[PDB]
């Protein structure tokens, strides 16, 4: 997308979202990141929405194929699951490459740095979902390390109702439950995050309250599923 203006890529990413063309949206936002400038809050959300939707569809397809393959216990189901898996890994590697070159290193404000480290944890978590064996251990640790750095910054620099802090804790709790085989850590993190947010809601405007309580309900929904 090197010949397209940054502002045109951003505008087209917004149009692609409205048209539910998320692969296009991700390609436009990759082009925008590769212009080399930092991203605003709105632009960070465009980048995350685009790739989360693309990889979310790949994950759903991989899960369908993996279930068929496991029930089967010819080579076609495995081959096609492997094709989808390789495509998913490629998208995760692309996102991780954008974060490493050079979004994270240029992100100095807590909001941007936590946002990008949360994304880094997420895309390593998606790699971990399809990984087997030993490199699987290192992929899991890479997710953990990214989430932990984001947690450390969020606890020092953001209030306990901040929606990025809350969403980070939500996703790190999913990591603990679904990837790291640590359901008690997942439950403890979700509960402590929920309770500390509840105690800070009194400080918020109506609009901030709506945002924080939305993510609190997601934490509660997981706690209900896990307990």
């Amino acid at each position: 997308m090197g010949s397209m203006e940054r502002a045109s890529l951003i505008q087209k990413a917004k149009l692609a979202e409205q048209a539910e063309r998320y692969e296009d949206m991700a390609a436009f936002m990759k082009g925008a990141v590769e212009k080399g400038e930092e991203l605003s809050c709105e632009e960070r959300n465009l980048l995350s929405v685009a790739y989360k939707n693309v990889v979310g569809g790949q994950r759903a397809a991989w899960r369908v194929l993996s279930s068929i393959e496991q029930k089967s216990n010819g080579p076609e189901v495995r081959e096609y699951r492997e094709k989808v898996e390789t495509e998913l890994q490629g998208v995760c590697d692309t996102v991780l490459g954008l974060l490493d070159s050079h979004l994270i290193k240029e992100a100095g404000d807590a909001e941007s740095r936590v946002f990008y480290l949360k994304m880094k944890g997420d895309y390593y978590r998606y790699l971990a979902e399809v990984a087997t064996g030993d490199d699987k251990k290192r992929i899991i640790d890479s997710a953990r390390s990214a989430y932990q750095e984001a947690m450390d910054i969020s606890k020092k620099e953001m209030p306990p109702t901040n929606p990025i802090r809350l969403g980070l804790a939500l996703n790190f709790s999913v990591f603990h439950y679904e990837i790291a085989n640590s359901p008690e850590e997942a439950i403890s993190l979700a509960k402590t995050t929920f309770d500390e947010a509840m105690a800070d809601l009194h400080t918020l405007s109506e609009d901030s309250y709506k945002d924080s309580t939305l993510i609190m309900q997601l934490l509660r929904d997981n706690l209900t599923l896990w307990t």
Partner: peptide, 9 residues
Amino acid sequence: AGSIPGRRS
């Protein structure tokens, strides 16, 4: 379990 959605909806 649910992770954060891309948009509030």
